[PDB]
Amino acid sequence: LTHGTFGPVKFYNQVKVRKRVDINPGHKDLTSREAQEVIMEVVFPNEVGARTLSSDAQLTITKEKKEELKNCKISPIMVAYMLERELVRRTRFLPIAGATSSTYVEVLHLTQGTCWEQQYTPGGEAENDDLDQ
Amino acid sequence: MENFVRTNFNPMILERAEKTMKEYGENPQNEGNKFAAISTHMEVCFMYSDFHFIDLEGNTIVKENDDDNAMLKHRFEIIEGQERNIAWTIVNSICNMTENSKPRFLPDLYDYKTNKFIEIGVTRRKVEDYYYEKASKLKGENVYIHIFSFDGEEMATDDEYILDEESRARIKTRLFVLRQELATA
């Protein structure tokens, strides 16, 4: 938002298609169990179960997270919680006009109403998948 | 025989054997296949762990008393006979302060001087049929297998016997006697 750019508001009848979309921008896409392995490695390393890190995704995330969260005086419960919310993909049925990308879904309240479009570009770069599509 | 573990072994192992076998279906009355077999899995561990400790620098010692007392420490940890949660908390606590590999399946002991994990596996088969049944499945990792025999013939990996010859000689006689009571039971 801080690095976003606003365009003009256009007034016109706004067609909204109810569709399942991402609501977790930056979801380093993994399953729930895969994230549980990651979370355990990062905050509860000594208490891990039998399983191991299976993918290069799980390894680079685990080593980055271990490095980024190093010596941060905070409840491990809150770290485990935020990592759970960050890693796993979450979806929702929402009525959407225009871009369906997660970063645009995130600002539906600001970019569309019943009769208006607020042109807006979120800070950051578009992913190639989106640009190609 | 149901009283094969109860008349021979001492009281402390009976409770260890009574524990985690309760999970699937069978019970002490059904089988003489894997009922008593689990009992000696802990007895061998105690003979392996007892009368063996480590010194201040990091050297082996085979002493008399057996209760640490400050300056000396146990040489083996009892992985088998625990809960599945504690089992891997044991394994992982080791690997985190000595850059080691994490075995896929459960080991049963760990030597603190040589940093070797030990998957125990003695049976009526001689040596070669049960050494390469595990070693070509738990490979890659260097999990130290110690394949004994029911009689006495011995064959470890590279014959690398970390244990001194006085205790392993009594370990043979501990299994050389239990073998003989299968027929009379």
Next chain:
Amino acid sequence: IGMASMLDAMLSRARIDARIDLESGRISSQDFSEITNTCKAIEALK
């Protein structure tokens, strides 16, 4: 998960935590015996 006792699990964890905290770490030799004695004292109280 586990069928074992809450106390036995804590005791099992206490013994090995004290182990690596000294064996390859930063806790003194007298303290290892100070903990395992208490685990023995606790184990006696059943």
